[PDB]
């Protein structure tokens, strides 16, 4: 099938561990510290991953950063969602960090995680495949809607190239539903929405200043 989709598949980064501190008492501050630490490390691999998206590296450093700063959370969320598809009411932030309802409650993330679970539910019924997952991630980056893009035409070209990949993929792989590509595209609004909630919530966590956050995570969160 489509070359871009398969290129994205081989470019998929390895899983990373959350490694929550075994010596620290379980609390909302510990959970949040673990997640922001995990996100910070993921953001690093996400930046290296983006270089593999056709045309992305040709954009100016400025535009590349603009796209990443607008889409970073959507990309992080898609990952959690995909790793959770074969689970029930649980979010696999990492193999060693699976959050259920109670954990979400004590971490003060019940509403955010419930929203991510809404994403998981919809993708489950659509039987989201890994090929579609990786393409959606790339598309989410390209269709980020940054308010500071220098070369609008180039970004639209990137969006177009990736949209075509998904289209070509669905036309060849899912003959039974000539509208599957569109359905995949129609799941983006909920991703954008959930991402916005997460960024807002974690911004308030940054302000309350009771949770340490690393350089890269803070840079994205302060974009
Ligand atoms: C939403 C999210 C996703 C992820 O993969 C790591 C951390 C956080 Cl806070």
Swiss-Prot record:
Tissues in which the protein is found: Expressed in the heart, kidney, brain, lung, bone marrow, adrenal gland, trachea, spinal cord and thyroid gland.
Post-translational modification: Acetylated by PCAF/KAT2 (in vitro).
Domain NR LBD: 1-223
Localization (cell): Nucleus
Coiled coil feature spans: none
Free-text function comment from the UniProt entry: Orphan receptor that acts as a transcription activator in the absence of bound ligand. Binds specifically to an estrogen response element and activates reporter genes controlled by estrogen response elements. Induces the expression of PERM1 in the skeletal muscle.
Additional note from the record: No physiological activating ligand is known for this orphan receptor, but 4-hydroxytamoxifen and diethylstilbestrol act as inverse agonists and deactivate ESRRG.
Record text on subunit structure and interactions: Homodimer. Binds TLE1, PNRC1 and PNRC2. Binds GRIP1. Interacts with NRIP1, NCOA1 and NCOR2.
Annotated family: Belongs to the nuclear hormone receptor family. NR3 subfamily.
Protein name: Estrogen-related receptor gamma
Taxonomic source organism: Homo sapiens (Human)
Residues of the full protein shown: 234 to 456 of 458
């Amino acid at each position: 099938y489509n070359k871009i989709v398969s290129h994205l598949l081989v470019a998929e980064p390895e899983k990373i561990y959350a490694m929550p501190d075994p010596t620290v008492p379980d609390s909302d501050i510990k959970a949040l510290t673990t997640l922001c630490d995990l996100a910070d490390r993921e953001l690093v691999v996400i930046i290296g991953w983006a270089k593999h998206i056709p045309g992305f590296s040709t954009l100016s450093l400025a535009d590349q950063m603009s796209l990443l700063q607008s889409a970073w959370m959507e990309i992080l969320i898609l990952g959690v969602v995909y790793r959770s598809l074969s689970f029930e009411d649980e979010l696999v932030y990492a193999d060693d960090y699976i959050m259920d309802e109670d954990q979400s409650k004590l971490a003060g993330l019940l509403d955010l995680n419930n929203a991510i679970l809404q994403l998981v539910k919809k993708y489950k019924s659509m039987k989201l495949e890994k090929e579609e997952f990786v393409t959606l991630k790339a598309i989410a980056l390209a269709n980020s809607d940054s308010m500071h893009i220098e070369d609008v035409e180039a970004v639209q070209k990137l969006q177009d190239v990736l949209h075509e990949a998904l289209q070509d993929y669905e036309a060849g792989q899912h003959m039974e539903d000539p509208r599957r590509a569109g359905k995949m595209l129609m799941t983006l609004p909920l991703l954008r929405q959930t991402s916005t909630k997460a960024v807002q919530h974690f911004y308030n966590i940054k302000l309350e200043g009771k949770v340490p956050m690393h350089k890269l995570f803070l840079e994205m969160l302060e974009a």
